[PDB]
Amino acid sequence: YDIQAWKKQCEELLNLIFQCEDSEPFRQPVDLLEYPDYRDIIDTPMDFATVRETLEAGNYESPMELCKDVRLIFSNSKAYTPSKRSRIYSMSLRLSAFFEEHISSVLSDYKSALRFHKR
């Protein structure tokens, strides 16, 4: 019932994601010189370095906020791809399945801790 435990658990999960080859296209902001139409399609850019920096600055109040920003990385990939068979889109679908498998317990444990605090 530790209400603060989610933060280290999210740092550890981000470390795993940065070690995965599938994260390489998503580690820094999309290069607008390589993709000059990107901002015509995508309203709010997001990347894993921006997520890690926001966490380490103390600017997430909950793991649900972190999870909304990671899911925006994946929805931006789905919106920008020209094909459901593209290389980079393929990489985002595998990384999303890995992220969702690992974040589920983080969210469950945090919500349980809050309910115990309010009991």
Ligand SMILES: CNC(=O)c1scc2c1OCCO2
């Ligand atoms: C050649 N580019 C692509 O097929 C795709 S699919 C998703 C993307 C991306 O390039 C930029 C990053 O996000």
